[PDB]
């Protein structure tokens, strides 16, 4: 593996709008996950056994 490291790789510059896209989606999906955790804890608080 070591003998192969001596030509460059091209830096994958995500555009400053494509970085925004992925950050916005990780926010939508991160907030949906919070709502599912909230909803499961609220049912667990309401259905005590």
């Amino acid at each position: 593996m070591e003998k192969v490291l001596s030509l460059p790789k091209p830096t994958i510059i995500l555009s400053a709008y494509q970085r925004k896209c992925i950050q916005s989606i990780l926010k939508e999906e991160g907030e949906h996950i919070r709502e599912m955790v909230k909803q499961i804890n609220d049912i667990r608080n309401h259905v005590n056994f």
């Binding site: 593996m1 192969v4 994958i12 555009s15 709008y17 494509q18 925004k20 896209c21 992925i22 916005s24 989606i25 990780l26 939508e28 999906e29 907030e31 949906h32 996950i33 709502e35 599912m36 909803q39 499961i40 049912i43 309401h46 259905v47």
Partner: protein, 97 residues
């Protein structure tokens, strides 16, 4: 350890094969993982709503009211999609009428 080292080396032989016929996989693993995560989110959300339906049918859970979110997307910059945004806006305006 030997089976992980054979697996890493079959994957090194595969990357060193793949390199000899050109560009772009690294963009798609990211988006195909986001597509999978969002589907798993929709799946658990539908399962949890069916559990709430069952608990409401059983009179074990009564409820008030809650709400839920929406998406967005950004644009290309570099010079060739004007007619696609203008057709997306014209089809939008035609569906306002």
């Amino acid at each position: 350890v030997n089976d992980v080292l054979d697996l890493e080396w079959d994957q090194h032989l595969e990357q060193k094969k793949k390199q000899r016929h050109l560009l772009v996989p690294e963009r798609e693993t990211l988006f195909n993982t986001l597509a999978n995560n969002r589907e798993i989110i929709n799946q658990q959300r539908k399962r949890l709503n069916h559990l709430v339906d069952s608990l409401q049918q059983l009179r074990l859970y009564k409820q008030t009211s809650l709400w839920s979110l929406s998406s967005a997307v950004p644009s290309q910059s570099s010079i060739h999609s004007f007619d696609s945004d203008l057709e997306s806006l014209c089809n939008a305006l035609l569906k306002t009428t």
